[PDB]
Symmetry: C3
Subunit: 90 residues, 3 copies
Amino acid sequence: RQEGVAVLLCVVIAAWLDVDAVTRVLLISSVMLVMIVELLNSAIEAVVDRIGSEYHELSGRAKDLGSAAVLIAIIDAVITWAILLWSHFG
Amino acid sequence: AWINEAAFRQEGVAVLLCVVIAAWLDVDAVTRVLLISSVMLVMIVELLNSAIEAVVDRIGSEYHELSGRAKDLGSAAVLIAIIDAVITWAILLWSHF
Amino acid sequence: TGFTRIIKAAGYSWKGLRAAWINEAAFRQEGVAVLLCVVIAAWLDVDAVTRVLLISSVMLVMIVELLNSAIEAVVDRIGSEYHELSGRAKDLGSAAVLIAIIDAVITWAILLWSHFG
Ligand SMILES: CCCCCCCC/C=C\CCCCCC(=O)OC[C@@H](O)CO
Ligand SMILES: CCCCCCCC/C=C\CCCCCC(=O)OC[C@@H](O)CO
Ligand SMILES: CCCCCCCC/C=C\CCCCCC(=O)OC[C@@H](O)CO
Ligand SMILES: CCCCCCCC/C=C\CCCCCC(=O)OC[C@H](O)CO
Ligand SMILES: CCCCCCCC/C=C\CCCCCC(=O)OC[C@H](O)CO
Ligand SMILES: CCCCCCCC/C=C\CCCCCC(=O)OC[C@H](O)CO
Ligand SMILES: CCCCCCCC/C=C\CCCCCC(=O)OC[C@H](O)CO
Ligand SMILES: CCCCCCCC/C=C\CCCCCC(=O)OC[C@H](O)CO
Ligand SMILES: CCCCCCCC/C=C\CCCCCC(=O)OC[C@H](O)CO
């Protein structure tokens, strides 16, 4: 899974950077949050597919809501990394 | 296709306004990240809760105890996320202002 | 109209917490651990950002625990028979819960170390 590669890289970079414990916790948690939301989104998708492969308005609605959740989580991670790194290198 | 709903617009706008306020506050970087992520988590959780509700409704209109339980548990998640946001903002802005 | 939704959702929420509490010792013990951590964090001599990280990390455990149990309830609602996708939904949801918990433990270990070590 190439999401776990993305994670280890983030952990390494956060480890590699010379920041204090708080910053490192925020950098890493924001990435872990994306992982948690992706997994929950995938669980919901699995349930939707369990019900039927045929299209339905509410199946689409479920999947789109789940995907927006993942998107908000990724945006939060980008913002977190941008803010902490700008401040670290200020 | 869901952004055109009174409930999501109201929740979305509150979160958006909080992110905007946080972007303008004179706080340090760690504080700013915490103010922003705590409200974004409210939105994430609310979206996952609506996702689950949609799957429940997909199954049908016949009531089942577990259908009610799924929706209740999703709402409780949102509630905890909201409390966490209030606690985060209160602790950080008491400290600062 | 925006006030009736709050009262309504609040009621669903309480029923969610109540059902989870009544139905499983493990949930009750988790809730005890969470409440303990929040109380402890609230009384520790640490800066405000550390205090928020200690509290929000255990709250996230509770948030993911509840979303996952919501997913379990839907799966069980559909049927009790074995189905690959049913198993997969629960596997993914449980993985998410475990990540939240491990992150909480590590967050607490790091911050309590840095503050004491
Ligand atoms: C600041 C902390 C906020 C909360 C943090 C998360 C805590 C979540 C855990 C538990 C909430 C209470 C659950 C209801 C209690 C309950 O059902 O009692 C049994 C009776 O119902 C029996 O009739
Ligand atoms: C329903 C479950 C509730 C769980 C939480 C119950 C609240 C009590 C929890 C823990 C108490 C143990 C530690 C006490 C030590 C103490 O007196 O320290 C005071 C000083 O540190 C103040 O500076
Ligand atoms: C919801 C009910 C609240 C009831 C609250 C009852 C009082 C609880 C107070 C403190 C909990 C113990 C942990 C903090 C103790 C402390 O300062 O430790 C500093 C270090 O030397 C050791 O970690
Ligand atoms: C949807 C639109 C998003 C567009 C994004 C891509 C474009 C950004 C390109 C270059 C950066 C220019 C230099 C700006 C540096 C910058 O942002 O600095 C922060 C402060 O310096 C912190 O204090
Ligand atoms: C001088 C300092 C001024 C400080 C101004 C503070 C304004 C924000 C207040 C509380 C915390 C954020 C709100 C947390 C709850 C939240 O975002 O709820 C969304 C919807 O209500 C439900 O989706
Ligand atoms: C949720 C809706 C709330 C609606 C009412 C909101 C009222 C305005 C409050 C705060 C704005 C920020 C004010 C402080 C700006 C601030 O800290 O500025 C310092 C430096 O000048 C920055 O460089
Ligand atoms: C979606 C792409 C996001 C791309 C990034 C947008 C982030 C915007 C947030 C806040 C503005 C604050 C800008 C300053 C950030 C920063 O690190 O400031 C040092 C301390 O915040 C105060 O000393
Ligand atoms: C539906 C929402 C329910 C949620 C209810 C929340 C009530 C307020 C909680 C905590 C703030 C008290 C903060 C006062 C003491 C204080 O200054 O704490 C900050 C410090 O800066 C930390 O170090
Ligand atoms: C249902 C919601 C229940 C909410 C439960 C959790 C509430 C945590 C609040 C405060 C902890 C901090 C206590 C005060 C810390 C403190 O002294 O901060 C100021 C100093 O002056 C800074 O130097």
